[PDB]
């Protein structure tokens, strides 16, 4: 929805945390995006894999509630409690202290999740960031793909909060936000004085 | 046609043999595709270069028959005689012991074929694989591009069967099929027992 | 317009000069294009960044005339005075001895121009090539992006003719044209004799 797009404008967010932290181009690329979003006052604008995976998300959500019996509340963008212009959009608030994060990737990506039993470190970061913004205690990581035989369609794993990884993330994100605002500050002053 | 798409589902085929054999990512990428095709029960789904080259194929076919006078029979997917789930789709059965393989690539690719007089090793593999599935003795390799001056439009070269390259191919393909089926076997057993 | 497309067919042009000169694949890639254009008798055929940047070009043109008060004449393809099949399409003839060259890139590219105050060396080459075909004395390099705050939207810098860089360019371009024509010559003779 357009509400939340506007809440997201220019903030670092859970799913881009791996880019912020990457040992790279995807960091400065991400920075540039956010600088532009802030300066221009909007975002830019998705393959049929993404589109299809979006449709399937509610199928996953339901399968999870079937599986567990949890009460899951859909939510908006949750701003970090302390770090301003930083936030998260979890797929839902599970019970009183949990979260859900749902993937509907390509069949092959799904299979590799079944194969290894573990979410990619970039998703670990994404979830840890969610827990950090929501002060929640665990996140359930669902992967779902209905094109598969029945016992391969659904996968779930819990990832417990981790205040250590969270501590790092908060630093890096704060540092990166410092850079990003000074970079904006800087251009303004050149452009300004120059005018 | 959809008939042949279904005959192709999940099999290694002549034109992907270079990927199987590559000294690489394109091998495991190909493997993943075939695993998915088998497990999901279908394929995924082409630029205007491909689309255009498909239209031009019958122009090439005719030019070849004009040039040679051969009787060429269009055929479906031809399964390897011994290696199961392996096959080939030659562009036609030329006479009693020949095949045709037709390219309508970009103008520049065509010119480089005129320039060197030889088909790319990946096409050598593709044709050798055709001869292997059809027990045919040679394949005529046509390249065609009508955007060119007249004497550059059409190129043809014969490639004789080669039971040595064919021997290798059959090994690699068999090995790769072994992997691919065990990989499927494996996931089933994890998923199964896990359910 | 289609007039100028036909004037451009098969010639090296100002904006592709960096490719000709590159220390690479983009050189032979460019060569192949031009060979194909000459042999086939036409060009091949752009994202929404390009499309959008094209729309904005007249906004830039006007802003420049607002800023300076110059009389700017839009022009076609200007053929090099001596080197045949070589030419330039400047964005306009400024006054009696100037040129304009207008960019409407992505916001981030624009910002990096504000940041460094200097046009990318590939644009230096492009402008020098314009001066070389027009015998003009300077080129004004405009970058424009209206999505930005007001004092960041518009940037301008002058680049004086430079007969030294121009001398180099003319060599490289002549050399590259020699190659390109002999390459065409060559294929003809193979194809010809072969027929
Ligand atoms: N533009 C757009 N439309 C729809 N879905 C999107 C879009 N961008 C990202 N996403 C998805 C991908 C992430 O899982 C989540 C953003 O979460 P966060 O924690 O806020 O990074 O939403
Ligand atoms: N999806 C699809 N549609 C149309 N044509 C295709 C498609 N995939 C491959 N091809 C072409 C490319 C190969 O020359 C041949 C497959 O031959 P084989 O020996 O079976 O690999 O058909
Ligand atoms: N196909 C097409 N349509 C519209 N605009 C184009 C096209 N190709 C290049 N350009 C733009 C990019 C260059 O600034 C200029 C060509 O200038 P020159 O000095 O001639 O290289 O025009
Ligand atoms: Mg999700
Ligand atoms: Mg073919
Ligand atoms: Mg321009």
UniProtKB/TrEMBL annotation, chains A, B, C:
InterPro entries: Lambda-type_endonuclease (IPR017482), NF-kappa-B_Signaling_Reg (IPR051703), PDDEXK-like_dom_sf (IPR011604), Restrct_endonuc-II-like (IPR011335), YqaJ_viral_recombinase (IPR019080). The keyword Nuclease applies. Residues 3-137 form the YqaJ viral recombinase domain. Keywords: Exonuclease, Hydrolase, Metal-binding, Nuclease. The keyword Amino-acid biosynthesis does not apply. Mg(2+) 2 binds at residues 91, 101-102. Mg(2+) 1 binds at residues 89, 91, 101. GO terms for molecular function: exonuclease activity; metal ion binding. It holds the Pfam family YqaJ. This is Exonuclease. The lineage of its organism: Bacteria, Pseudomonadati, Pseudomonadota, Betaproteobacteria, Neisseriales.
């Amino acid at each position: 929805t357009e509400e939340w797009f506007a809440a997201r404008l220019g903030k670092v967010t859970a799913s881009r945390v791996a880019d912020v932290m990457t040992k790279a181009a995807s960091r400065q690329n991400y920075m540039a995006e956010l600088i532009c979003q802030r300066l221009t006052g909007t975002q830019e604008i998705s393959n049929a894999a993404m589109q299809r995976g979006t449709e399937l998300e509610p199928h996953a959500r339901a399968r999870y509630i079937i599986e567990t019996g949890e009460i899951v509340t859909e939510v908006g963008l949750i701003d970090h409690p302390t770090i301003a212009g930083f936030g998260a959009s979890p797929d839902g608030l599970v019970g009183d202290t949990g979260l859900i994060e749902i993937k509907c990737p390509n069949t092959w990506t799904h299979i590799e999740t079944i194969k290894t039993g573990k979410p990619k470190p970039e998703y670990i970061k994404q979830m840890q960031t969610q827990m950090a913004c929501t002060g929640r205690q665990w996140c359930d990581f669902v992967s779902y793909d209905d094109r598969l035989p029945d016992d391969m369609q659904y996968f779930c794993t819990r990832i417990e909060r981790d205040d250590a990884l969270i501590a790092e993330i908060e630093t890096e994100v704060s540092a990166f936000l410092a850079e990003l605002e000074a970079e904006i500050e800087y251009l303004k002053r050149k452009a300004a004085k120059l005018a």
